[PDB]
Amino acid sequence: MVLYFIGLGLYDERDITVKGLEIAKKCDYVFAEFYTSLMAGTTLGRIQKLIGKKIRVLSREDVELNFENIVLPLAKENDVAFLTPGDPLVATTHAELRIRAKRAGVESYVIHAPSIYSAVGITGLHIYKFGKSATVAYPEGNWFPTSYYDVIKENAERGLHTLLFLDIKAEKRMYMTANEAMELLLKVEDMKKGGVFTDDTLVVVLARAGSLNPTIRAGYVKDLIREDFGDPPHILIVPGKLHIVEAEYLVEIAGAPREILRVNV
Amino acid sequence: MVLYFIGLGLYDERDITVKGLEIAKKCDYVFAEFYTSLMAGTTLGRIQKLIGKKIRVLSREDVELNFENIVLPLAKENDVAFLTPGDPLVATTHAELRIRAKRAGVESYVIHAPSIYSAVGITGLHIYKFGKSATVAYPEGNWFPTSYYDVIKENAERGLHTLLFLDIKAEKRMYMTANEAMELLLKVEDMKKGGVFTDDTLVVVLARAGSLNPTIRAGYVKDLIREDFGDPPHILIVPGKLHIVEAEYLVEIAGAPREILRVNV
Ligand SMILES: Nc1ncnc2c1ncn2[C@@H]1O[C@H](CSCC[C@H](N)C(=O)O)[C@@H](O)[C@H]1O
């Protein structure tokens, strides 16, 4: 009679909360989805071993089209868990699944876990200064989406930071790198000429948040565009004007050039 | 030889990540602060029992003025952990403490935990639509903070949602309720008269996120301003223009007036 939405956290199998783990262990059935994002620091096998339960993976179609036929029927007479990378309901489509549960007469509860949305606090940038977020999508064919560029423009002009989720082909396990994102943004700038993203733009790259050894780098595009930030996933941030405290953290912790203390504050 | 900043999560001792727990259990010394937020579902005793270590609680003064005198000295010859509610670097000034650690020759690591900043996803509002955040602080003496009002105005004009952290005075055991926040906002409105926050404004309240049964309510200020949302902590949200699916969730899950389903495109 109960469905638990349980977050797996940021990177590996230990990023689930103690609450989420103990609840998952007591569930009769455990499902999981890895299409909204991936858990790059672990494997399905390691997650399964930790929980001690067989984990049935669901595709985007399984969920978006058949959640009420695959998961809810079992949740009617058993305790069922639905695992998702990060924090449940951060992904925009997740929330509606709770309405489906209600419609089916199934109680649902949410067990939170760390999300990249909040983990970016490790960049030293004040969380309150982050504005609207956006996703950099790979262009393809004759389709060249650029809405993320406008998001940076609107946030930056108001002195706010912009969190940029990078494209991911979950099924193929292909991650867009911060380098590719920077190249794309420079390409968009060359087309819109808005003066929003150039070689002189200060950016911050956060790779493998959740890991004990994440890569946190800050610097100008001209210097970071060909830099190796390590294995995925990568997150790109275009900060707005910096509070001196944010700048000092970027210099001392993220290796930012001293120049940001006089140019970006 | 190291200092760990470990988050404890949203509500109770089990909101800590497995990673955080396994590391905390092996540390030589464990310190913590409980003034940046309120974990309403646990006690120091329960946290100590879970981690299996004595926890030395520090006051805001101990941390802000003497972190380098109380904590860092031990981290030079021992494995030390510094625990905090939620995520250690979200809506706190703890990031700067990493700079102090560095200057002291102490390597530091960060272990994330569920944060209210991302837990708001449980309101059904799209996380990417949240703009700049703000804090509603208690007025004191002849000083009446009003900056949060301008944040709402700025976000709303852009169609973005506004997350409002509520004030906390841990030593006095005072936790601002969503009701008190709404009352303060109505007073600022009468002063600035910007038509930003009135009796007809739609708001969302999230109380005790992290618990299994948090209070999630949406409605007009005139109706919710005197409603009992249960024990603290509380957070207040002022939505911007709603997507149809956001409205549907607020109606179905947060008990919002069905009239909000009719969005004005
Ligand atoms: N479980 C919870 N439910 C509702 N609001 C919460 C909450 N935990 C924190 N808050 C809100 O956030 C304020 C503390 S701000 C510090 C937040 C913390 N670092 C985190 O990551 O969550 C509180 O005064 C309250 O308004």
What single letter denotes the amino acid at residue B157? E
Cα-atom radius of gyration of chain A, to the nearest Å?
Answer: 20
Which is nearest to A211 in space by CA: A10, A50, A43? A10
Preceding peptide of A233 cis, ω within 30°: yes
* CA B194 – CA B203 distance, rounded (Å): 17
User: Looking at the complex, does the CB of residue B182 fall below 8 Å from at least one CB of chain A?
Assistant: no
* CA A74 – CA A80 distance, rounded (Å): 7
Which is nearest to B126 in space by CA: B250, B1, B265, B257? B250
Q: Half-sphere exposure (CA, 13 Å, Cβ side) for B218?
A: 26
Hey, where are the domains in chain B? 1-114, 115-265
Which is nearest to A242 in space by CA: A259, A222, A227, A263? A263
Whole-angstrom CA distances from A48 to A33, A45, A260 are: 13, 5, 45
* CA B83 – CA B228 distance, rounded (Å): 31
Angle, nearest 10°, between helix axes A147-157 and A178-192? 80
Nearest chain A residue (CA) to B212: A109
Nearest chain A residue (CA) to B162: A131
For residue A132, the distance in angstroms to the closest alpha carbon of chain B comes to 5
Does an H or E element contain A107, and which? strand A107-111
For residue B23, the distance in angstroms to the closest alpha carbon of chain A comes to 11
The structure tokens listed for A186 are 């420079």
**Resolution in Å, one decimal place:** 1.8
Residues B118 and B127: beta-carbon distance below 8 Å: yes
Q: How many Å lie between the centroid of ligand 1 and the Cα of residue B170?
A: 13
The structure tokens listed for A9 are 């956290």
Q: How was this structure determined?
A: X-ray
Q: How many Å lie between the centroid of ligand 1 and the Cα of residue B233?
A: 7
8 Å CB contact of A132 and B99: no
The structure tokens listed for A56 are 């049935």
Q: How many residues does chain A have?
A: 265
8 Å CB contact of A112 and B87: no
Which residues fall within 8 angstroms of residue A7, CB to CB, at 6 or more apart? A16, A17, A20, A83, A84, A85, A86, A87, A88, A111, A112, A113, A114, A115, B114
Topology of domain B115-265, CATH: 3.30.950
Q: B-chain residues within 8 Å CB-CB of A12? A: 19
Which is nearest to B122 in space by CA: B223, B236, B253? B253
Residue A152: exposure state from Cβ atoms within 10 A (0-12, 13-18, ≥19): buried
Minimum-distance ligand 1 atom for the alpha carbon of B113: 21
* CA B41 – CA B14 distance, rounded (Å): 10
* CA A86 – CA B146 distance, rounded (Å): 34
**3-state secondary structure string, chain B?**
CEEEEEECECCCHHHCEHHHHHHHHCCCEEEEECCCCCCCCCCHHHHHHHHCCCEEEECHHHHHHHHHHHCHHHHCCCEEEEEECECCCCCCCCCHHHHHHHHCCCEEEEECCCCHHHHHHHHCCCHHHECCCEEECCCECCECCCHHHHHHHHHHHCCCEEEEEECEEHHHCEECCHHHHHHHHHHHHHHHCCCCCCCCCEEEEEECECECCCEEEEEEHHHHCCCCCCCCCEEEEECCCCCHHHHHHHHHHHCCCHHHHCCCC
Residues B63 and B97: beta-carbon distance below 8 Å: yes
From edge to edge, which strands make up the β-sheet containing B162-166?
Answer: B134-136, B162-166, B234-238, B202-207, B215-220
Topology of domain A1-114, CATH: Cobalt-precorrin-4 Transmethylase; domain 1 (3.40.1010)
Residues A1 and A106: beta-carbon distance below 8 Å: yes
Preceding peptide of B233 cis, ω within 30°: yes
Q: What is the largest CA-CA distance in chain A?
A: 63
Beta B234-238 vs B202-207: how paired, if at all? antiparallel
* CA A182 – CA A179 distance, rounded (Å): 5
User: Looking at the complex, does the CB of residue A160 fall below 8 Å from at least one CB of chain B?
Assistant: yes
8 Å CB contact of B95 and A121: yes
Which residues fall within 8 angstroms of residue A144, CB to CB, at 6 or more apart? none
Residue with tokens 């979200």: B90
The structure tokens listed for B168 are 């906390």
